[PDB]
Amino acid sequence: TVDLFTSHGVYRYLTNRTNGLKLTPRENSFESHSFERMPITEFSNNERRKG
Amino acid sequence: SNNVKPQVFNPDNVMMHEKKDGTLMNEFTTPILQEVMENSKIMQLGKYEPMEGTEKKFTFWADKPGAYWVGEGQKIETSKATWVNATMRAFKLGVILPVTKEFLNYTYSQFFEEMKPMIAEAFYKKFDEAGILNQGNNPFGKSIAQSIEKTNKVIKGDFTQDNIIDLEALLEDDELEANAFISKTQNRSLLRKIVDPETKERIYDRNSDSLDGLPVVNLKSSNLKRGELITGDFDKLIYGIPQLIEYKIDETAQLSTVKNEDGTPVNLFEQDMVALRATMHVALHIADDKAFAKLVPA
Amino acid sequence: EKKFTFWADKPGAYWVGEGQKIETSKATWVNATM
Amino acid sequence: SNNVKPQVFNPDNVMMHEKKDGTLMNEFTTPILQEVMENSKIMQLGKYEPMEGTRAFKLGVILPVTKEFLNYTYSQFFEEMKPMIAEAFYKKFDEAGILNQGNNPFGKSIAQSIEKTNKVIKGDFTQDNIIDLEALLEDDELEANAFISKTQNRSLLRKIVDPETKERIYDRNSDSLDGLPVVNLKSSNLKRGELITGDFDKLIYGIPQLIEYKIDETAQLSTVKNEDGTPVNLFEQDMVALRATMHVALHIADDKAFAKLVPA
Numbered sequence: 305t306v307d308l309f310t311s312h313g314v315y316r317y318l319t320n321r322t323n324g325l326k327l328t329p330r331e332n333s334f335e336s337h338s339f340e341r342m343p344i345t346e347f348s349n350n351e352r353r354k355g
Numbered sequence: 356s357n358n359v360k361p362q363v364f365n366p367d368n369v370m371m372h373e374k375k376d377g378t379l380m381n382e383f384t385t386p387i388l389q390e391v392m393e394n395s396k397i398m399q400l401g402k403y404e405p406m407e408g409t410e411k412k413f414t415f416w417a418d419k420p421g422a423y424w425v426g427e428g429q430k431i432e433t434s435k436a437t438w439v440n441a442t443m444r445a446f447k448l449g450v451i452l453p454v455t456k457e458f459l460n461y462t463y464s465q466f467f468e469e470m471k472p473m474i475a476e477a478f479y480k481k482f483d484e485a486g487i488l489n490q491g492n493n494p495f496g497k498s499i500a501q502s503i504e505k506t507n508k509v510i511k512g513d514f515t516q517d518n519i520i521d522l523e524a525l526l527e528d529d530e531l532e533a534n535a536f537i538s539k540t541q542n543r544s545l546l547r548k549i550v551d552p553e554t555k556e557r558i559y560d561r562n563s564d565s566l567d568g569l570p571v572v573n574l575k576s577s578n579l580k581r582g583e584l585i586t587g588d589f590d591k592l593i594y595g596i597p598q599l600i601e602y603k604i605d606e607t608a609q610l611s612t613v614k615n616e617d618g619t620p621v622n623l624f625e626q627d628m629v630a631l632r633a634t635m636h637v638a639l640h641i642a643d644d645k646a647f648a649k650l651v652p653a
Numbered sequence: 654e655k656k657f658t659f660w661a662d663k664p665g666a667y668w669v670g671e672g673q674k675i676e677t678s679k680a681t682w683v684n685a686t687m
Numbered sequence: 688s689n690n691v692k693p694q695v696f697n698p699d700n701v702m703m704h705e706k707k708d709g710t711l712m713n714e715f716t717t718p719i720l721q722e723v724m725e726n727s728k729i730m731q732l733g734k735y736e737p738m739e740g741t742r743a744f745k746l747g748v749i750l751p752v753t754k755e756f757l758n759y760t761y762s763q764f765f766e767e768m769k770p771m772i773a774e775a776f777y778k779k780f781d782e783a784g785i786l787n788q789g790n791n792p793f794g795k796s797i798a799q800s801i802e803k804t805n806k807v808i809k810g811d812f813t814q815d816n817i818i819d820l821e822a823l824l825e826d827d828e829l830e831a832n833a834f835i836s837k838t839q840n841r842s843l844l845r846k847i848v849d850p851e852t853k854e855r856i857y858d859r860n861s862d863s864l865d866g867l868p869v870v871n872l873k874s875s876n877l878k879r880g881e882l883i884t885g886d887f888d889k890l891i892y893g894i895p896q897l898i899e900y901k902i903d904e905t906a907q908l909s910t911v912k913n914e915d916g917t918p919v920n921l922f923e924q925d926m927v928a929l930r931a932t933m934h935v936a937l938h939i940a941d942d943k944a945f946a947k948l949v950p951a
Contacts, residue, residue, distance in 0.1 A: 357790035368679040381740040386658040386682040449675040477666040624906030
């Protein structure tokens, strides 16, 4: 099950490895969000992102 | 010698910037591709299996203990479990593309970019035709067509709901259920014109490419004839990839499988040439020889 | 006038035994014009 | 290797630490340049042409060196040899373009231009013969730009004086004749009594690839046979080789722009 976050909403899809990860929209795939930028944030341990 | 005519090669596999008639190939318009690169159908249908070495071991239960009624105070009889082992090994796919450095500079710099996908396609197709159809000098002693041949699990006749149902029934006759169909795109014409006379519904979805509700996968190979159809419980087809496609480019090796006009092997350094090597390791295993059946025209 | 270059031949591939020589292969293209 | 006799190579182009007579060049003194290094004359005179892609032809050479020599005789060899190869390329290109010598690959050359137009003066060096040589160019509205000469004939040029102004027509300090610069060719093919002149802006050249050097420790030198006839393997025989290559192109825009003076 795959969630894709854009600057305007979340798209939901279904896939399997066997079919080659062909994304198929899930029932009621789209869901709007009220932010104006992609909601996920990444943090970094150092410039190289090494543990 | 100061011989300035271009080097003739045998076989003519070397890319060159100058033709033996004296034509010099500047201003080359990079070719475009009228096609989409084909996926591996085995990688699509079968089950991936992590494999670190060139060999893999599987072990499965085989026998299960019985059990007894015993009277009060009677001796309780014994029983026993049993197991069985299976194994799969990998093989190597490879190809080398030699290029003259003049060609690599003054005609088609991107050549060792554009080839890498066409190489991957060639590997996938080789793999599929070996594992599915047992064609192209199949290295494995294993294949779908070969399991079908040893079981003689073949139906003869025309594409009809009758025969298609019989084909699927041939699997549950061994307690297995069909999961997909393999067919030749030439034959969806035949599937498109068969209908149930009772419920009056068509067995093949022209829109979704589904046959009797199961997904159909099309082979590009020319070995699978129009009237032929294959089905099986593809979750019983196991594949592993110990080494994904590796590319190496070399400017100094010797190629022995290409000879100069005088018969000497091509030396990439002394002759100022470059060549691209692609290799891939792939392993195939049929977990149950009975899990596959085929329909063939009479 | 217009001119086109299209791929015509894909490079082959060979099953190679452990330590056997990898055979070579070549690409090819064809020209068309309108 | 354990061979106590040195390896004979055919052709004998491999550099070695030990001579055929058993002499190790140990402790070996650094070579020094007894002569000035020569620079390309058509690259000096002719007009450069920005060129993309190749007509061009490929110059190239391979210098094999025994790693014992690269260790125990003259370590810096490959750094000190690159200019000497550039010299060799300059000389090969100059000799091909000017004199039509050395199996030149082009169908174009100054010697062929002159031999086609028959624009040749038979005679010894005299002020009247120099003036006639120049007039052979100015006849066709082209003016001489420079002179090409065998340096060994400055002894002849110093003996000519303008009988009106009564001074040397040849400035031996400037090395300019009648006010025009004279370039010297070291090659053996241009004879003592031969002199060439032209409007060298009518000679065009291009260089798609500058001198590229690649040092290799692994290739096979098919062209160099061991004593037994097997090809030389660098890695296995513990050997190193330097490859140099260049692409040059030559064009003559007007073959009447060149004239030649030659002894009678």
